[PDB]
Amino acid sequence: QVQLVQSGAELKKPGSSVKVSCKASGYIFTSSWINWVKQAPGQGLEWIGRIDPSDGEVHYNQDFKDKATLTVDKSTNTAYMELSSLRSEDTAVYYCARGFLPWFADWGQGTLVTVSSASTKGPSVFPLAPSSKSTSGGTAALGCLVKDYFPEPVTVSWNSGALTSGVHTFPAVLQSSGLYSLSSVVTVPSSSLGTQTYICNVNHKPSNTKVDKKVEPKS
């Protein structure tokens, strides 16, 4: 079993450098190159550079020329990639693949380098109350707006998991403020609105937050 295990996710303030690692097991470390690919969120794979553990020989993509620095320890079977002057553009997932030469045979699970100067902030929950009293519509859309939080992630359940069908917890967006924010909605029967209680259970472990916000029809 070949195996490349990368370091734990990193959170860094702009301007800071970072040193991600990759440990291989399952073969001859010094017989294969160790590659490094960057993949920003929702983006593709960008190659950073390559290094021969055998002697430290290294060839970098000129674009990361001033950003990436691949070093390697042949005694501890690990390769390193130190990034400098971390900025937003540096926020991505860094992978370490091994090549039985030209091909990337085995990859690492990747490391998530998140560059932001923002500090741990619990979210502010707001209701997304249903608005309408008709006979044409049967479903009513309601939900919660977990807003201005950091870092990821925020877990959201309805009526403590008693509600799952129709629920929709979208992917968090990273606001200009640098803080995260997401919305959760569930489509439910207008009739139930006055007989069933709806509550979203938002938790943000980072800030040790837990909040239940009853979302009801704004009559």
Partner: protein, 214 residues
């Protein structure tokens, strides 16, 4: 600098089909091309290499061909799991590059979104901030144009949105757009509109509310 251009960008197929993805290099790379598959929050899995050699372990329905600058990935019997995104890349010369990728999503009949507009809460307004939310529920296909309109004035740059991953039951997509304004700013107007344009709509559907009016 060799460029790898895939095609299409999004392949919408149905289980069993025999899908074929293309990847064109901008320079000869002999057969130094390799295909990878990738699922959300997972590391790329090598599929083919050498332009045709099926990596040890890959299912046989996967096959790759090509040489020079024209390459094509092939799945003869698209399985319920082969639904993901596929990348091609060349390691011929430096620097190594990858294709933009091809999303192979599940096909289904068109279905317009179910739209809902949400005024900002009073609670949030107390904090001098207003977030207007527009919900486009379970629609297909994924292409959807959303436009906010305050007092019928087009907005720009004050709205963000996120799309769910193709649902696992009705294979639809849900989008959520947010128009962020300041308390005063917000109170300085009446009508807030959310115009949604989608293939499943004969004409753009709008959903609006008025500050105050219940």
């Amino acid at each position: 600098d060799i460029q790898m251009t895939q095609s299409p960008s999004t392949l919408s197929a149905s289980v069993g089909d025999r899908v074929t993805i293309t990847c064109k290099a901008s320079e000869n790379v002999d057969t130094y091309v390799s295909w990878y598959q990738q699922k959300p929050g997972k590391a790329p899995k090598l599929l083919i290499y050498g332009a045709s050699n099926r990596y040890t372990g890959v299912p046989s329905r996967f096959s790759g061909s090509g040489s020079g600058t024209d390459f094509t990935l092939t799945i003869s019997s698209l399985q319920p799991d082969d639904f993901a995104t596929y990348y091609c890349g060349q390691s011929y010369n430096y620097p190594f590059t990858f294709g933009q990728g091809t999303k192979v999503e599940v096909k289904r009949t068109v279905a317009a979104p179910s739209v809902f507009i949400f005024p900002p809460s009073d609670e949030q307004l107390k904090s001098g901030t207003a977030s207007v939310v527009c919900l486009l529920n379970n629609f297909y296909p994924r292409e959807a144009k959303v436009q906010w309109k305050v007092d019928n004035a087009l907005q720009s740059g004050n709205s963000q949105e996120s799309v769910t991953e193709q649902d696992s039951k009705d294979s639809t997509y849900s989008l959520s757009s947010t128009l962020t304004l300041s308390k005063a700013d917000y109170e300085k107007h009446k009508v807030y509109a959310c115009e949604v344009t989608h293939q499943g709509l004969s004409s753009p559907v709008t959903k609006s509310f008025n500050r105050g009016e219940c």
